[PDB]
């Protein structure tokens, strides 16, 4: 149970961190940030789509033998994070100034998402 909860929250924090990095930017090598708060409106989407997946499975698992359910859950949440990231970044991804930033933001996103697999 604790593992399922921490997985969900983990993917949430992955997405939020990625979008926040896309917002504020990276100062060291002078990557300019967008200047918009997209993490908060995307977290709500993530939450809305998550209420359908996590309680539903958590209600119906054989805790003794159900880590593969947790695995498909990881897959679904991963795809969700990808989709929501690209969707949230989409209207601002036409100016090279911001494309250079979203390269790194996406990179950190996939870093975290990579760190979520067992």
């Amino acid at each position: 149970i604790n593992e399922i909860v921490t997985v969900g929250l983990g993917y949430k924090t992955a997405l939020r961190k990625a979008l926040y990095t896309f917002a504020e930017g990276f100062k060291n090598k002078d990557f300019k940030g967008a200047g918009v708060s997209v993490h908060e409106t995307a977290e709500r989407h993530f939450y809305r789509q998550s209420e359908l997946l996590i309680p539903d499975v958590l209600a119906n698992v054989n805790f003794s033998q159900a880590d593969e359910v947790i695995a498909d859950l990881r897959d679904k949440l991963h795809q969700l994070c990808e989709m929501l990231f690209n969707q949230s970044v989409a209207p601002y991804a036409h100016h090279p100034k911001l494309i250079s930033t979203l390269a790194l933001a996406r990179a950190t996103l996939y870093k975290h998402l990579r760190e979520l697999k067992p």
Binding site: K29, A93, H94, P96, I99, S100, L102, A103, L104, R106, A107
Partner: protein, 154 residues
């Protein structure tokens, strides 16, 4: 389902100095349409199917940089144009901002001038597919690859 083979590249490698000279001496892909050696080169793949024509114009136009400008390197996935231009180290990212903001013929021109200056190594079929579509996501992905590789090798 019809794909343009890598054979084209090989053909370009094996083509004589005369016709290659006729091809390199070109400003725009439409002027590439103007010359016959091009039609003789691109027929097998081929030119007579309009679905392929634009893609062929771009590919051949890029190859027209030189016989050994674009260096093919086999691969999980091969080195991409962004990664290639980044690895070269001769390209400034502003000119790629230009490349992503360019329109129609201009971008191809800008692209060619880059290749000649870069002498890049890459997997040719990837560049071929990207030139086949060359949408907004191909541009964006190009810039992403370049920026990320340059940031990762600094």
């Amino acid at each position: 389902d019809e794909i343009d083979a890598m054979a084209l590249y090989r053909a370009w490698q094996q083509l004589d100095n005369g016709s290659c000279a006729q091809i390199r001496r070109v400003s725009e892909p439409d002027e590439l349409r103007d010359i016959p050696a091009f039609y003789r080169l691109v027929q097998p793949f081929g030119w007579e199917n309009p679905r392929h024509q634009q893609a062929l114009l771009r590919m051949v136009f890029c190859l027209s940089a030189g016989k050994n400008v674009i260096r093919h390197q086999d691969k999980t996935t091969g080195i991409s144009l962004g990664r290639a231009l980044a690895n070269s180290g001769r390209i400034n990212e502003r000119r790629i901002f230009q490349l992503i903001r360019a329109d129609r013929t201009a971008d191809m021109v800008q692209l060619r001038r880059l290749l000649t200056h870069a002498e890049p190594v890459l997997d040719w079929p990837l560049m071929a597919r990207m030139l086949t579509w060359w949408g907004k996501r191909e541009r964006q992905q190009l810039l992403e690859d370049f920026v990320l590789t340059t940031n990762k090798n600094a």
